Design a protein around this motif. Structure first.
Motif, PDB file in Angstrom:
ATOM      1  N   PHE A 107       0.875  -1.051   0.078  1.00 12.27           N
ATOM      2  CA  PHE A 107      -0.084   0.168   0.142  1.00 12.27           C
ATOM      3  C   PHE A 107       0.942   1.256  -0.012  1.00 12.27           C
ATOM      4  CE2 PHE A 107      -2.683   2.984   1.845  1.00 12.27           C
ATOM      5  CZ  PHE A 107      -3.781   3.061   1.392  1.00 12.27           C
ATOM      6  N   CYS A 108       0.709   1.908  -0.897  1.00  8.39           N
ATOM      7  CA  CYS A 108       1.429   3.394  -1.221  1.00  8.39           C
ATOM      8  C   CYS A 108       0.492   4.648  -1.159  1.00  8.39           C
ATOM      9  CB  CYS A 108       2.218   3.169  -2.511  1.00  8.39           C
ATOM     10  SG  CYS A 108       3.347   1.872  -2.531  1.00  8.39           S
ATOM     11  N   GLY A 109      -0.360   4.463   0.191  1.00 11.62           N
ATOM     12  CA  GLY A 109      -1.105   5.672   0.522  1.00 11.62           C
ATOM     13  C   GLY A 109      -0.461   6.438   1.541  1.00 11.62           C
ATOM     14  N   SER A 110      -1.343   7.259   2.287  1.00 10.08           N
ATOM     15  CA  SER A 110      -1.028   8.074   3.345  1.00 10.08           C
ATOM     16  C   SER A 110      -0.740   7.320   4.433  1.00 10.08           C
ATOM     17  CB  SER A 110      -2.200   9.381   3.530  1.00 10.08           C
ATOM     18  OG  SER A 110      -2.104  10.089   2.469  1.00 10.08           O
ATOM     19  N   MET A 111       0.006   7.917   5.540  1.00  7.98           N
ATOM     20  CA  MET A 111       0.138   7.302   7.097  1.00  7.98           C
ATOM     21  C   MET A 111      -1.183   7.382   7.535  1.00  7.98           C
ATOM     22  SD  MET A 111       3.584   7.743   9.171  1.00  7.98           S
ATOM     23  CE  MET A 111       3.521   7.164  11.025  1.00  7.98           C
ATOM     24  N   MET A 112      -2.016   8.289   7.089  1.00 11.28           N
ATOM     25  CA  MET A 112      -3.272   8.840   7.867  1.00 11.28           C
ATOM     26  C   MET A 112      -4.353   7.644   7.311  1.00 11.28           C
ATOM     27  SD  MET A 112      -2.816  11.504  10.036  1.00 11.28           S
ATOM     28  CE  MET A 112      -1.512  10.197  10.449  1.00 11.28           C
ATOM     29  N   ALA A 113      -4.260   7.277   6.290  1.00 14.26           N
ATOM     30  CA  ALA A 113      -5.529   6.503   5.495  1.00 14.26           C
ATOM     31  C   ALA A 113      -5.647   5.270   6.351  1.00 14.26           C
ATOM     32  CB  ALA A 113      -4.932   6.206   4.067  1.00 14.26           C
ATOM     33  N   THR A 114      -6.761   4.727   6.440  1.00 14.18           N
ATOM     34  CA  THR A 114      -7.368   3.657   7.060  1.00 14.18           C
ATOM     35  C   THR A 114      -8.460   2.852   6.523  1.00 14.18           C
ATOM     36  OG1 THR A 114      -6.948   4.926   9.019  1.00 14.18           O
ATOM     37  CG2 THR A 114      -8.041   3.136   9.378  1.00 14.18           C
ATOM     38  N   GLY A 115      -8.540   1.519   6.714  1.00  9.61           N
ATOM     39  CA  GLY A 115      -9.524   0.627   5.877  1.00  9.61           C
ATOM     40  C   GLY A 115      -9.203  -0.608   5.915  1.00  9.61           C
ATOM     41  N   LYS A 116      -9.799  -1.436   5.070  1.00  2.00           N
ATOM     42  CA  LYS A 116      -9.891  -2.887   4.794  1.00  2.00           C
ATOM     43  C   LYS A 116      -9.938  -3.175   3.742  1.00  2.00           C
ATOM     44  CE  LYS A 116     -10.921  -3.960   9.814  1.00  2.00           C
ATOM     45  NZ  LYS A 116      -9.609  -4.240  10.171  1.00  2.00           N
ATOM     46  N   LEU A 117      -9.065  -4.309   3.247  1.00  2.00           N
ATOM     47  CA  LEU A 117      -9.072  -5.025   2.060  1.00  2.00           C
ATOM     48  C   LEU A 117      -9.152  -6.499   2.302  1.00  2.00           C
ATOM     49  CD1 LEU A 117      -6.422  -3.091   0.147  1.00  2.00           C
ATOM     50  CD2 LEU A 117      -8.817  -2.801  -0.410  1.00  2.00           C
ATOM     51  N   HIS A 160      -8.896 -16.677   2.566  1.00  2.00           N
ATOM     52  CA  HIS A 160      -8.651 -15.052   2.634  1.00  2.00           C
ATOM     53  C   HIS A 160      -7.980 -14.422   3.607  1.00  2.00           C
ATOM     54  CE1 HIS A 160     -12.012 -15.065   5.552  1.00  2.00           C
ATOM     55  NE2 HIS A 160     -12.069 -13.725   5.357  1.00  2.00           N
ATOM     56  N   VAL A 161      -7.181 -13.195   3.505  1.00  2.00           N
ATOM     57  CA  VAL A 161      -6.570 -12.177   4.590  1.00  2.00           C
ATOM     58  C   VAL A 161      -7.390 -10.911   4.487  1.00  2.00           C
ATOM     59  CG1 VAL A 161      -4.476 -11.669   5.265  1.00  2.00           C
ATOM     60  CG2 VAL A 161      -4.793 -13.652   3.731  1.00  2.00           C
ATOM     61  N   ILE A 162      -7.862 -10.704   5.651  1.00  2.00           N
ATOM     62  CA  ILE A 162      -8.272  -9.249   5.724  1.00  2.00           C
ATOM     63  C   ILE A 162      -7.251  -8.346   6.411  1.00  2.00           C
ATOM     64  CG2 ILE A 162      -9.917  -7.553   6.922  1.00  2.00           C
ATOM     65  CD1 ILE A 162     -11.702 -10.291   7.228  1.00  2.00           C
ATOM     66  N   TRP A 163      -6.814  -7.588   5.094  1.00  2.00           N
ATOM     67  CA  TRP A 163      -5.509  -6.785   5.524  1.00  2.00           C
ATOM     68  C   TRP A 163      -6.117  -5.234   5.789  1.00  2.00           C
ATOM     69  CZ3 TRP A 163      -3.174  -4.953   0.345  1.00  2.00           C
ATOM     70  CH2 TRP A 163      -2.135  -3.896   0.356  1.00  2.00           C
ATOM     71  N   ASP A 164      -5.687  -4.884   7.124  1.00  2.00           N
ATOM     72  CA  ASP A 164      -5.859  -3.570   7.643  1.00  2.00           C
ATOM     73  C   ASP A 164      -4.697  -2.864   6.956  1.00  2.00           C
ATOM     74  OD1 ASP A 164      -6.744  -1.507   8.983  1.00  2.00           O
ATOM     75  OD2 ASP A 164      -6.749  -2.290  10.878  1.00  2.00           O
ATOM     76  N   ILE A 165      -5.146  -1.666   6.340  1.00  2.00           N
ATOM     77  CA  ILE A 165      -4.091  -0.897   5.818  1.00  2.00           C
ATOM     78  C   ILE A 165      -3.565   0.113   6.863  1.00  2.00           C
ATOM     79  CG2 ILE A 165      -4.088   1.207   4.538  1.00  2.00           C
ATOM     80  CD1 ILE A 165      -6.180  -0.252   2.547  1.00  2.00           C
ATOM     81  N   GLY A 166      -4.260   0.421   7.803  1.00  2.00           N
ATOM     82  CA  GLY A 166      -3.777   1.245   8.872  1.00  2.00           C
ATOM     83  C   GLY A 166      -2.827   0.776   9.719  1.00  2.00           C
ATOM     84  N   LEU A 167      -2.808  -0.599  10.042  1.00  2.00           N
ATOM     85  CA  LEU A 167      -1.793  -1.558  10.747  1.00  2.00           C
ATOM     86  C   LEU A 167      -0.472  -1.773  10.027  1.00  2.00           C
ATOM     87  CD1 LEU A 167      -4.560  -3.247  12.707  1.00  2.00           C
ATOM     88  CD2 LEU A 167      -3.442  -1.059  13.324  1.00  2.00           C
ATOM     89  N   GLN A 168      -0.938  -2.453   8.920  1.00  4.67           N
ATOM     90  CA  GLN A 168       0.294  -3.030   8.137  1.00  4.67           C
ATOM     91  C   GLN A 168       0.171  -2.633   6.554  1.00  4.67           C
ATOM     92  OE1 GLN A 168      -0.036  -7.196   8.663  1.00  4.67           O
ATOM     93  NE2 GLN A 168      -1.571  -7.610   6.984  1.00  4.67           N
ATOM     94  N   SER A 169       1.326  -2.193   6.223  1.00  4.22           N
ATOM     95  CA  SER A 169       1.162  -1.595   4.683  1.00  4.22           C
ATOM     96  C   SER A 169       1.424  -2.496   3.502  1.00  4.22           C
ATOM     97  CB  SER A 169       2.417  -0.216   4.719  1.00  4.22           C
ATOM     98  OG  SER A 169       2.399   0.373   5.546  1.00  4.22           O
ATOM     99  N   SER A 170       1.740  -3.656   3.965  1.00  6.10           N
ATOM    100  CA  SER A 170       1.845  -4.573   2.852  1.00  6.10           C
ATOM    101  C   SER A 170       1.166  -6.067   3.674  1.00  6.10           C
ATOM    102  CB  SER A 170       3.323  -4.961   2.697  1.00  6.10           C
ATOM    103  OG  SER A 170       4.024  -5.882   3.718  1.00  6.10           O
ATOM    104  N   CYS A 171       0.767  -6.672   2.638  1.00  6.64           N
ATOM    105  CA  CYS A 171       0.252  -7.991   3.010  1.00  6.64           C
ATOM    106  C   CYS A 171       0.977  -9.459   1.900  1.00  6.64           C
ATOM    107  CB  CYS A 171      -1.157  -8.233   2.511  1.00  6.64           C
ATOM    108  SG  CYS A 171      -2.002  -9.692   2.936  1.00  6.64           S
ATOM    109  N   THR A 172       1.402 -10.274   2.509  1.00  9.88           N
ATOM    110  CA  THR A 172       2.199 -11.423   1.709  1.00  9.88           C
ATOM    111  C   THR A 172       1.125 -12.508   1.557  1.00  9.88           C
ATOM    112  OG1 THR A 172       4.080 -10.374   2.534  1.00  9.88           O
ATOM    113  CG2 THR A 172       4.188 -12.581   1.225  1.00  9.88           C
ATOM    114  N   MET A 173       1.301 -13.287   0.436  1.00  8.71           N
ATOM    115  CA  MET A 173       0.205 -14.460   0.445  1.00  8.71           C
ATOM    116  C   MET A 173       1.111 -15.567  -0.589  1.00  8.71           C
ATOM    117  SD  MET A 173      -3.623 -14.611  -0.352  1.00  8.71           S
ATOM    118  CE  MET A 173      -4.925 -15.528   0.533  1.00  8.71           C
ATOM    119  N   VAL A 174       1.353 -16.588   0.092  1.00  6.86           N
ATOM    120  CA  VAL A 174       2.080 -17.658  -0.567  1.00  6.86           C
ATOM    121  C   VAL A 174       0.991 -18.789  -0.999  1.00  6.86           C
ATOM    122  CG1 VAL A 174       4.001 -19.264  -0.308  1.00  6.86           C
ATOM    123  CG2 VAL A 174       3.698 -17.602   0.936  1.00  6.86           C
TER     124      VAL A 174
END
Lengths: 163, 201, 238, 123, 104, 163, 13
Positions: free
Chosen positions: E1-11, E34-48
């Motif tokens: 994720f390459c948004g703001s440090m302030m941005a928050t949400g879930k993917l 699936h993986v629920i990726w919280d943007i505000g907490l971790q800027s990346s999500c890995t999936m093998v």
């Protein structure tokens, strides 16, 4: 048949392979006019609450030469009874080989008080048609017996017997 | 008035809070005089807390309950007429029909004789009658609130109290009222809730 | 600190389980031997169905009055839990309701998350009406039950007698409620009877700086725990 | 002697397993570690689907020429086995085919029951 | 994720195994892997993803991304972010039978 | 506001520095229409005598960016409530820094039965006005919660609930 | 209504 000797005999015969069950008995031992007036049911009519298991026992009363298979299916409560042999087989069932064992016992566990159609079903289907050797009759009878298990429990007497 | 008080919570216990006698109904019966008598020859009341707001509120503070039930019957009769009423002392049948059992429909109904149903035979003028019904619930606690339905396309049975007068052909009409005093006992409760208003009570 | 939790094929992210409430201090547990019976017969599929299920997010606004869900109702279309909830006749289950809520530091407001046993609502006499399922229903400020009464003629300020948490955005933005199986019976029908009910009401209303995001997301993630049912258990004698 | 066998919720009666053949003297077995891989990844649901399934009976007559079934095909509508056989993409399974046949002592005839690997039929 | 440090949400990062058509809605994705990726907490999500093998000589599975929640920004912060994606083989990965086919 | 959701929120805003208190709550948990219908008050209505401590807890529900100070004053019984911030400070008080702690708890000890205005007061004053960083709203809400302590005691049940 | 009940035969004596 009712109030005769023939009300106790489920007749097996030779007829087209309709997977309609030979019998489908609902497991309401207190209110089911079949199980109602059994000794079990007669005692259960005296009580308000009860719980335990019921062992049913079908007894084949055909020839020593007769051979075939029946499917004795158990439908748990909340499930409507199976209408075809496949539905019965994919559930809980016993394939009863007539030529090998003359009776089949089945202990149903989740029997409890009606209130104050549920309980489940014991159904019987033809897996195979019955095979006889010669002019042996192609019309047999199966009897059925029911009882409570040692675990079975009743409480709160409700004698309701008047005129 | 402003007094120093040490720690004392005994009277806020569930037993102290609930186990207090309180009238839950006033049944009425008239003597079996074949004069004009209806309905009147026998009284029936389904036991319930939902008809008295005090007990109802105190219980609806909680979700689930268990309690025995000490019923106490205070009978009070008098002659209905200015008639110079002479009447030999009456006897009252106070039958408790357990849960899920048939109710009387007549004075001469079969249920009154049934062995199942415990009955008190109370002679007027004597001490008020008393019985203690136990926890007669089908489930493991009386549920005051039940989110759920009977069938998929709240209420719990404590029993019934029926009352009649046993004396048969009385010349003078004697009206009678039986105040039922319920006292929960051995009360346990679970899952507190906010109280309601006094609005729909 | 960011704790990533996996149940089955399902993974969620939690900032921290720092304040995670357990209703009545009782953790979910299977039906114990003292209250069970080998003739009233349960089985335990707490293998696959007991996973995180994440409902469709709701949008908290300035005008939002509240939301509510029933359990196990909300999970009646949720994969194996929903399957078991209809195949089986009798079932019991605790839950872990993780209400996450995503807001900036320039939003403000507070939610009261309340877990209610036997949450009988009222303007009630209808199954479809009383059980909205996965999407749940919403409260009002005047069917849909009333905000300050919880529907059940009941001042909301006293609602904190129920198991609850407060999501105050300046502090924590998530809440977790660990709900044990609560019923008058040890086991019961799931389809006919909802044991628990979640109710999320904005105590303090939403507000935010000039051109912030106008409506923030509240997300529910419900995990069944110690899910167990009947009971196909037949003895065939020789 | 009459042996009653239970698999799951399913019970059958066998006069005796007196002559029960094992193709190539090899019993069914899971995929062994020497031939498996933690990156080509299997799971084992041999809990519930692995039960007795009893097809609809066929009727042997004087005119009958024979019958045939394919596997796992025949079990593609058979409850959890049929479910798994479509949910999952790759699968392996052995079988136990118990051909019972009910006749009197005054019937006569013989059947050859043949299990064929890669039974490619043709007109 | 390459948004703001302030941005928050879930993917929702869903994995559909091979033979399964890809999920079209967030619920279908959630009820799968699936993986629920919280943007505000971790800027990346890995999936093998494990079951990758040779085509021949559409299958293999899918990695899908859904909005669980919409993205929350504090102020006039832009409401248009970018996510990048990176792929690699694992140490386990294996190739064989060279087939250089490079001509003009 | 009454019988709505807004009856629970004390709104802080931006307005002239009048040292009038934000709130002044009298500590009559049995007869005070605010504390009366709390769970505490609902139970106290069932009893005739009671004594103990009450912990009040004010919770700030503004922005994480908001900063300021409030003065939470306690006036003991027999003392009329303070009307200005200085009177409050020279008494028993807590200066609650909003930016540092989102809640403030205060345990009042001398709570006892009315009879059969006294008890004291919990007041809240602006020490400082609230400071926000940007277009952040200048209208916050504080909630308030009350409970008895473990020490608290009631006696002589007085159910008075009729129609 | 469908309640788990332990063994109890005292009232059938």
């Amino acid at each position: 048949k009712k109030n005769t000797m023939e009300m106790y005999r489920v007749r097996l015969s030779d007829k087209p392979h309709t997977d309609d069950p030979i019998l489908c008995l609902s497991l309401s031992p207190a209110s089911d006019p079949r199980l109602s007036h059994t000794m079990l049911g007669e005692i259960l009519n005296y009580y308000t609450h009860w719980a335990g298991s019921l062992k049913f026992t079908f007894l084949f009363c055909g020839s020593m030469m007769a051979t075939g298979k029946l499917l004795v299916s158990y439908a748990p409560p909340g499930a409507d009874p199976p209408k075809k042999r496949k539905e019965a087989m994919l559930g809980t069932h016993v394939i009863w080989d007539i030529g090998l064992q003359s009776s089949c016992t089945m202990v149903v566990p989740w029997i409890s008080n009606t209130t104050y159609t549920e309980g489940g079903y014991i159904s019987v289907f033809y897996q195979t048609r019955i095979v006889v050797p010669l002019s042996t009759p192609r019309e047999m009878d199966i009897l059925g017996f029911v009882s409570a298990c040692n675990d079975f429990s009743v409480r709160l007497l409700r004698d309701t017997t008047h005129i | 008035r402003h007094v120093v008080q040490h720690r004392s919570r005994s009277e806020s216990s569930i037993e102290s809070f609930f186990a207090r006698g309180a009238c839950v109904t006033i049944m009425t019966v008239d003597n079996p005089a074949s004069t004009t008598n209806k309905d009147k020859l026998f009284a029936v009341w389904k036991i319930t807390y939902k008809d008295t707001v005090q007990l109802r509120r105190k219980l609806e503070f909680f979700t689930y309950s268990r309690f025995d039930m000490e019923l106490t019957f205070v009978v009070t009769a008098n002659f209905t007429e200015t008639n110079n009423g002479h009447a030999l002392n009456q006897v009252y049948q106070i039958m408790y029909v357990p849960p899920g059992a048939p109710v009387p429909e007549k004075w001469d109904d079969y249920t009154w004789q049934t062995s199942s149903n415990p009955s008190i035979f109370y002679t007027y003028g004597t001490a008020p009658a008393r019985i203690s019904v136990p926890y007669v619930g089908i489930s493991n606690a009386y549920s005051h609130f039940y989110d759920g339905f009977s069938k998929v396309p709240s209420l719990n049975d404590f029993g019934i109290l029926a009352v009649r007068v046993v004396n048969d052909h009385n010349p003078t009409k004697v009206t009678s009222k039986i105040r039922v005093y319920l006292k929960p006992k051995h009360i346990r409760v679970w899952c507190p809730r906010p109280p309601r208003a006094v609005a729909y009570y | 600190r960011v704790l990533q939790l996996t149940l089955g094929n399902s993974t969620i992210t939690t900032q921290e389980a720092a304040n995670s409430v357990v209703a009545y201090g009782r953790w979910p547990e299977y039906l114990r031997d003292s209250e069970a019976n080998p003739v009233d017969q349960p089985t335990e599929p707490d293998v696959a169905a007991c996973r995180f299920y994440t409902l469709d997010t709701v949008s908290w606004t300035k005008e939002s009055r509240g939301w509510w869900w029933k359990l196990p109702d909300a999970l009646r279309d949720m994969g194996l839990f929903g399957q078991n909830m209809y195949y089986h006749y009798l079932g019991r289950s605790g839950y872990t309701v993780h209400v996450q809520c995503n807001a900036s530091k320039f939003h403000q407001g507070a939610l009261g998350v309340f877990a209610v046993p036997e949450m009988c609502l009222a303007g009630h006499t209808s199954y479809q009406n009383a059980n909205p399922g996965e999407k749940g229903g919403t409260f009002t400020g005047t069917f849909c039950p009333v905000d300050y009464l919880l529907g059940n003629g009941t001042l909301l300020g006293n609602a904190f007698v129920f198991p609850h948490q407060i999501i105050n955005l300046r502090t924590n933005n998530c809440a977790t409620l660990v709900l044990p199986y609560v019923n008058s019976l040890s086991i019961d029908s799931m389809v006919k009877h909802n044991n628990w009910g979640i109710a999320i009401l904005p105590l303090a209303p939403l507000n935010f700086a000039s051109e912030s995001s106008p409506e923030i997301p509240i997300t529910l993630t419900i995990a069944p725990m110690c899910c167990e049912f009947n009971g196909l258990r037949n003895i065939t004698l020789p």
